[PDB]
Design a protein around this ligand. Structure first.
Ligand SMILES: CN(C)C(=O)c1ccc(F)cc1Br
Lengths: 245, 179
């Protein structure tokens, strides 16, 4: 992540991020709604950071330092460039909505009143079709990526040294290769939980309540389509094992 | 320090997310309780042994039968949760959660955990449950279910007050270390 965004989302909540004199100008219901929107953006910033560790630290480091067989790096990090493009674009829209809402003279005081429309746009049309295609592919290749990682770490000395080197810093404690893969697979199922809680505190404006209700339905439709489109790929699986599913 | 993996399972109302949040911060949040939990790697020393215990939540995956199992590879210990204020969450343990965990995590120890133990003697909880001819889960009902399902053990805790939370994760670490 870049320092400007890390600092903007360093606080544990929106109520601790804004100036206390600005917080005191709002009703409790607005504070509750803003705290959950802040958690959605903060966790999205961390999710894009997980994807950058996978593309920049691991994938590109293996290509530039190691002598792996062709197709091995793609097997460890399936769809990571596509996932990075989807979420970096979504994060850009969330951060621009926050930036437009800032009070003049402030880099921290804002209220986002219109998130629903942004979520309907993200979870409909071509961006939803790309999310469905990419997660159906990624999640079907998840078990294979973990098995490939374990085989390389146990048998290739230079690979083991590389992993131990780049994951030694304390800031990588939660972000080993296998941890990154499961953080990405679990991201999509966090959205309904966050959206439902924002919706609970968005009844003040009926158009906003309706828009978040529509967004929640679109997110659940996407998840149901991805879940129905998954079948774990296995290296060396025979056709007979596949058609006898 | 050896690395071990813990996964918590249970119904949406069992309090699994809150339990992981309270343990990982050693505090019940005073300003904002997070809606979701990403992951965490806890440094735990139990009976003289140092372990890095990676913690994972299955919240949000309950309705997605092909996404949910992706949380299980290489799990070393399962916390199988129910809420003491919800006998319905306890009824779903033996024939939904238990067969799934035994299938994807063979031979992995399961600790059955009764969450929200502070609500056992809460008057509002007792009034609400009595309308459906129910009462808070009794300790013997929890122990009997743990015995029936082949659990390694039965424990209770309250994420709200933190009582019993440290003991659950220290025991899970001991279970993860056993042969
Ligand atoms: C085909 N395949 C990899 C599985 O059924 C599987 C096995 C174990 C596990 F912990 C998660 C899964 Br998903």
């Amino acid at each position: 992540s870049m320092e400007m965004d890390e600092k903007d989302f360093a606080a544990d909540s929106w109520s601790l991020a804004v100036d206390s004199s600005f917080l005191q100008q709002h009703k409790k219901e607005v504070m509750k709604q803003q705290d959950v929107i802040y958690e959605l953006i903060q966790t999205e910033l961390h999710h894009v950071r997980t994807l950058k560790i996978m593309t920049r630290l691991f994938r590109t480091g293996m290509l530039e330092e190691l002598h792996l067989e062709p197709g091995v790096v793609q097997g460890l990090f399936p769809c990571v460039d596509e996932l990075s493009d989807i979420h970096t674009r979504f994060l850009s829209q969330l951060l621009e909505r926050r930036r437009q809402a800032l009070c003049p003279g402030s880099t921290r005081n804002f209220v986002i009143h219109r998130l629903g429309d942004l979520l309907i746009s993200q979870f409909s049309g071509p961006s939803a079709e790309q999310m469905c295609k990419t997660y159906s592919e990624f999640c079907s290749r998840h078990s294979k990526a973990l098995k490939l990682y374990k085989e390389l770490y146990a048998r290739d000395k230079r690979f083991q040294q590389f992993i131990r080197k780049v994951t030694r810093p304390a800031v990588l404690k939660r972000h080993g290769v296998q941890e990154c893969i499961l953080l990405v697979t679990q991201r999509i199922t966090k959205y309904p939980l966050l959206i439902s809680r924002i919706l609970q505190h968005s009844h003040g404006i009926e158009e906003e309540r309706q828009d978040l209700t529509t967004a929640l339905g679109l997110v659940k439709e996407l998840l149901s389509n991805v879940d129905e489109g998954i079948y774990q790929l296995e290296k060396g699986a025979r056709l007979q094992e596949i058609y006898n599913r | 320090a050896i690395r071990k993996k813990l996964v918590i399972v249970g119904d949406g109302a069992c309090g699994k997310t809150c339990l992981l949040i309270v343990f990982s911060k050693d505090q019940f949040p005073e300003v904002y309780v997070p809606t979701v939990f990403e992951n965490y790697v806890a440094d735990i020393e139990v009976d003289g042994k140092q372990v890095e215990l990676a913690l994972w939540d299955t919240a949000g995956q309950e309705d997605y039968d092909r996404l949910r199992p992706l949380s299980y590879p290489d799990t070393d210990v399962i916390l199988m949760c129910f809420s003491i204020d919800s006998p319905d969450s306890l009824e779903n343990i033996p024939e939904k959660w238990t067969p799934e965990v035994k299938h994807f995590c063979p031979n992995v120890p399961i600790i059955l955990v009764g969450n929200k133990k502070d609500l056992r003697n809460d008057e509002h909880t007792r009034r609400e449950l009595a309308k459906m001819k129910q009462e808070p889960v009794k300790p013997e009902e929890g122990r009997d279910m743990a015995n029936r399902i082949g659990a390694f053990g039965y424990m209770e805790c309250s994420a709200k007050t933190k009582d019993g939370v440290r003991e659950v994760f220290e025991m899970a670490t001991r279970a993860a270390l056993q042969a």
